[PDB]
């Protein structure tokens, strides 16, 4: 579960930053 | 040399809006990022133009004086940079981001 | 009287058409996007364009038959692509 | 019960323009944020210092950074490889 | 930031069993892809065995199968049998003519 | 017993056809003494408040801003006409009560009006807009349209 939760942490952060930029539009 | 690099890093615009002839309709003015080599070209040309308004017959003297004034804060090319950044802030939504 | 004054709010919105949006004072451009979605989900723009010129009944029937086939064809295409992806995932 | 739609025999199984996920450029998102930071706190405001520093590093050598995410879809390779197996065609 | 969008996190129900894969992004995407209104049947009167034509005087029930403007939904969306779709459409058209819908 | 005409809201109607854009600004006037009249039934009172009278205040087309012939139906003509309307609503002190926007058709000026109202040109009017709606008129059968053009 840690191995999966580590990849999930990265993607969440990445996709919570593209949203911020895309939404800023 | 450190003074020159600091002046070039402060005078060059970070971004510049460019017109892209995309589509038969009107071209789009989209802000574009600039690399360090492209930034130095923009700032250097502004310095040379400012230098060539000085009285000395020798370009080295005019360039030296211009660089000294820029290192001391006074330069008329900072207005150019502010006007290039204002345009880009206006067209921030025109950016594509993909 | 006041009975006809205090019962006008619901009455006013009881005869709704379904083509109205309450604007979000914060993001007013999101409410216009919601209205556009209603227009497209009720085919309002398409219907208006199709009513500009008269089409013979036979031509109308042909166009309706072809459109249905393309809709059904796409559903069959997507079903086959899903099988391909599933088969690829399992190593087939 | 969900209606299955079966395609006729086809000369090919192909996606005209396979969709690909194109990750956003890191330098462009940095520029979109810095530009926004100047829109609220003002141009050259001390609040956007970090944005300016990050943008300079991202674009220092290439104005779009090291773009190394180019990708092509393989759906058409698998679709053509597996179509004859999975189309459910009757025997000859 | 100590916050994540709900669309980027899965909330595991209570009493259910889970695998390590349930914490991945694949589970999020897989749940979106296979998200169908399958629980409608148990809440869908017209998929229970009633005759839709008996609801021609009950606009509230009929208004569940029309769009915001009153357009009858295609069978592809309602998921009804041919007979119930045929009967439901008649009920709505009769309701409209009576002055209730 | 006394005419007490008062404005309750404003209606900003836009008709966006293929060749022109018409923008009308109106006021929904309500005589606040209508219920004080004699011989008035509950139905007449409710029927009067369900369709309140309207008075036209501003009427604009793309030809009022100098756009002529083919230019009247273009995106730029609508964008400027929308700006002139948003300005005339502030220059007439008609930005006190809530505004309801009604769009009629899907020509090239429909997206210009929306852009002019969600942008700088309509930053004052948008704050008062409370409800947006569509009023495109469709026919269920109806009259026979003209024949298809062979071009
Ligand atoms: Mg024209
Ligand atoms: Mg004629």
Length in residues, chain C: 92
B27 neighbors D58 (Cβ within 8 angstroms): no
Q: Which residue has the tokens 């345009």?
A: B87
> What's the gap in Å between F144 CA and the centre of ligand 2?
10
| Alpha carbon distance F79, F21 (integer Å) | 10
Length in residues, chain E: 101
E23/A4 touch (CB, cutoff 8 Å), yes or no: yes
Measure D12 CA to nearest chain A CA, in Å. Answer: 37
Residue C39's nearest CA partner among C67, C14, C17, C23 is: C17
> What's the gap in Å between E15 CA and the centre of ligand 2?
72
Distance of CA F104 to the CA centre of its chain: 9
| Alpha carbon distance B74, C29 (integer Å) | 44
φ, ψ for residue F6 (rounded to 5)?
A: -140, 150
Q: Is A22 on the interface with B (CB under 8 A)?
A: yes
The continuous run of DSSP H or E covering C31 comes out as helix C28-41
Q: Which distant-in-sequence residues (6+ apart) come within 8 Å of F85 by Cβ?
A: F12, F23, F25, F58, F60
Print the SS3 string covering chain D.
CCCCCCCCCCCCCCCCCCCCCCCCCHHHHHHHHHHHHHHHHCCCCHHHHHHHHHHHHHHCCCCCCCCCCCCCCCHHHHHHHHHHHHCCCCCC
The continuous run of DSSP H or E covering F46 comes out as helix F42-50
Residues paired with residue F88 on neighbouring β-strands, in sequence order: none
| Alpha carbon distance B37, B46 (integer Å) | 15
Strands (DSSP E) along chain F, which ranges? 5-16, 21-31, 54-61, 99-103, 129-134
- Is the four-CA dihedral E73, E77, E80, E82 of positive or negative sign? positive
**What does each C-alpha distance from F48 to D15, F6, F29, F102 come to in angstroms?**
60, 14, 11, 21
SS3 B2: helix
Give the residue on A whose Cα is nearest the Cα of B93: A25
F15 neighbors F26 (Cβ within 8 angstroms): no
Residue B66's nearest CA partner among B22, B1, B7 is: B7
Strands (DSSP E) along F17-114, which ranges? 21-31, 54-61, 99-103
Residue F74's nearest CA partner among F40, F108, F43, F23 is: F108
DSSP classification of residue F35: G
| Alpha carbon distance F107, F92 (integer Å) | 28
- Enter the tokens of residue C78: 């997507």
Pairing of β F21-31 and β F5-16: antiparallel
**What does each C-alpha distance from D77 to C31, D13, D17 come to in angstroms?**
43, 10, 13
Distance of CA C14 to the CA centre of its chain: 23
F12 neighbors F90 (Cβ within 8 angstroms): no
> What's the gap in Å between B27 CA and the centre of ligand 2?
41
Q: Is D19 on the interface with B (CB under 8 A)?
A: no
SS3 F15: strand
The resolution, in angstroms to one decimal, equals 2.9
Q: Which residue has the tokens 């034509």?
A: E53
F106 neighbors F142 (Cβ within 8 angstroms): no
| Alpha carbon distance C17, E69 (integer Å) | 6
| Alpha carbon distance E26, E32 (integer Å) | 10
Q: Is C38 on the interface with E (CB under 8 A)?
A: yes
**What does each C-alpha distance from D66 to D25, D26, E31 come to in angstroms?**
9, 9, 34
Chosen from A2, A8, A15 to mutate, greatest number of chain E CBs within 10 A: A8
- Enter the tokens of residue E12: 């595991």
B36 neighbors D59 (Cβ within 8 angstroms): yes
F122 neighbors F88 (Cβ within 8 angstroms): no
Q: Is F5 on the interface with C (CB under 8 A)?
A: no
Chosen from C77, C79, C82, C91 to mutate, greatest number of chain D CBs within 10 A: C77
Q: Is D76 on the interface with C (CB under 8 A)?
A: no
F56 neighbors F112 (Cβ within 8 angstroms): no
The continuous run of DSSP H or E covering C20 comes out as strand C20-22
B93/A25 touch (CB, cutoff 8 Å), yes or no: yes
Q: How far apart are the first and last CA of chain E?
A: 50
| Alpha carbon distance B69, C21 (integer Å) | 60
Q: How many CB atoms lie within 10 A of CB B5?
A: 10
SS3 B43: helix
Between positions 6 and 45 of B, the ones with CB within 8 A of D are 14-15, 31-36, 38
Residue C55's nearest CA partner among F147, F141, F142 is: F147
The continuous run of DSSP H or E covering F109 comes out as helix F109-117
Residue D63's nearest CA partner among B31, E76, F36, A13 is: B31
Between positions 122 and 141 of F, the ones with CB within 8 A of C are 126-127, 129-136, 138-139
Long-range CB contacts for residues D81-86, cutoff 8 Å, separation at least 24: D82/C83, D82/C84, D82/C87, D82/C88, D82/C92, D83/C80, D83/C84, D83/D10, D83/D12, D83/D13, D85/C87, D85/C92, D86/C80, D86/C83, D86/C84, D86/C87
Q: Is B93 on the interface with A (CB under 8 A)?
A: yes
F138/C47 touch (CB, cutoff 8 Å), yes or no: yes
SS3 E94: helix
> What's the gap in Å between F147 CA and the centre of ligand 2?
8
| Alpha carbon distance F7, E93 (integer Å) | 40
φ, ψ for residue F54 (rounded to 5)?
A: -125, 145
φ, ψ for residue F138 (rounded to 5)?
A: -115, 155
E1/A16 touch (CB, cutoff 8 Å), yes or no: yes
Kindly give the interhelix angle for F109-117 and F75-90, rounded to the nearest 10 degrees: 40
B29 neighbors B40 (Cβ within 8 angstroms): no
> What's the gap in Å between F22 CA and the centre of ligand 2?
25
Smallest Cβ–Cβ distance between D86 and the set C73, C75, C83 belongs to C83
F53 neighbors F29 (Cβ within 8 angstroms): yes
Residue B85's nearest CA partner among B24, B22, B9, B12 is: B12
- Enter the tokens of residue F19: 């060749």
SS3 E48: coil
Smallest Cβ–Cβ distance between A12 and the set E4, E20, E21 belongs to E4
Residues paired with residue F134 on neighbouring β-strands, in sequence order: F103
Q: Is D33 on the interface with B (CB under 8 A)?
A: no
Distance of CA E44 to the CA centre of its chain: 8
Print the SS3 string covering B52-95.
CCCCCCCHHHHHHHHHHHHHCCCCCHHHHHHHHHHHHHHCCCCC
Residue F19's nearest CA partner among F78, F94, F85 is: F78
D33 neighbors D51 (Cβ within 8 angstroms): yes
């Amino acid at each position: 579960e840690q191995e999966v939760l580590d990849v999930w942490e990265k993607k969440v952060v990445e996709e919570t930053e593209l949203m911020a930029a895309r939404t800023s539009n | 040399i450190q003074a020159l690099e600091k002046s070039l890093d402060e005078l060059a615009p970070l971004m510049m809006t460019k017109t892209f002839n995309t589509g038969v309709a009107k071209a789009s003015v989209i802000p574009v990022p600039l690399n360090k080599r492209q930034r130095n070209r923009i700032a250097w040309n502004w310095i040379v133009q400012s230098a060539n308004q000085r009285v000395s017959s020798d370009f080295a003297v005019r360039l030296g004086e211009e660089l000294t004034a820029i290192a001391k804060g006074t330069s008329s090319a900072f207005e150019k940079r502010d006007q290039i950044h204002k345009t880009a802030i206006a067209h921030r939504a025109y950016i594509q981001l993909k | 009287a006041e009975i006809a004054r205090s019962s006008v709010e619901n009455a006013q919105m009881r005869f709704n058409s379904g083509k109205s949006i309450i604007v979000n004072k914060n993001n007013p451009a999101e409410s216009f996007k919601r209205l556009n979605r209603i227009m497209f989900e009720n085919n309002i723009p398409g219907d208006k364009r199709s009513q500009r010129f008269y089409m013979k009944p036979g031509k109308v029937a042909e166009l309706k038959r072809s459109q249905r086939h393309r809709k059904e064809f796409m559903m069959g295409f997507k079903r086959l692509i899903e099988i391909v992806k599933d088969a690829k995932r399992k190593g087939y | 019960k969900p209606p299955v739609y079966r395609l006729p025999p086809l000369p090919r199984l192909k996606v005209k323009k396979p969709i690909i996920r194109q990750e956003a450029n890191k330098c462009l998102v940095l520029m979109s944020n810095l530009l926004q930071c100047w829109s609220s706190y003002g141009h050259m405001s001390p609040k956007c210092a970090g944005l300016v520093t990050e943008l300079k590093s991202c674009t220092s050598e290439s104005a779009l950074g090291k773009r190394n995410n180019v990708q092509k879809s393989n759906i058409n390779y698998h679709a053509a490889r597996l179509y004859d197996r999975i189309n459910g065609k009757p025997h000859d | 930031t100590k916050k994540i969008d709900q669309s980027l996190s899965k909330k595991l129900p209570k009493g259910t069993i889970y695998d390590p894969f349930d914490f991945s992004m694949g589970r999020i995407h897989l749940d979106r892809k296979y998200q169908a209104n399958k629980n409608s049947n148990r809440n869908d009167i017209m998929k229970s065995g009633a005759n839709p034509l008996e609801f021609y005087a009950r606009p509230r029930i009929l208004s569940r199968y029309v769009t915001s403007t009153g357009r009858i939904q295609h069978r592809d969306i309602t998921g009804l049998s041919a007979k119930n779709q045929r009967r439901l459409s008649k009920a709505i058209r009769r309701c409209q003519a009576i002055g209730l819908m | 017993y006394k005419p007490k005409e008062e404005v309750v809201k404003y209606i900003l109607h836009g008709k966006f056809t293929k060749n022109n854009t018409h923008l009308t600004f109106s006021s929904v006037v309500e005589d606040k003494n209508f219920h004080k009249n004699k011989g008035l039934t509950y139905n007449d009172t409710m029927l009067y408040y369900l369709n309140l009278p309207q008075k036209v205040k501003i009427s604009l087309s793309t030809g009022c801003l100098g756009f002529r012939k083919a230019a009247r139906g273009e995106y730029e003509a609508a964008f400027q006409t929308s700006g002139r309307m948003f300005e005339l609503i502030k220059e007439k002190n008609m930005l006190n009560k809530d505004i309801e926007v009604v769009m009629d058709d899907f020509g090239k000026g429909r997206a210009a009006f929306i852009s002019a109202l969600v942008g700088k040109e309509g930053a004052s009017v948008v704050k008062k807009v409370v409800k947006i709606s569509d009023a495109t008129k469709l026919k269920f059968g109806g009259v026979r349209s003209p024949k298809m053009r062979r071009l």
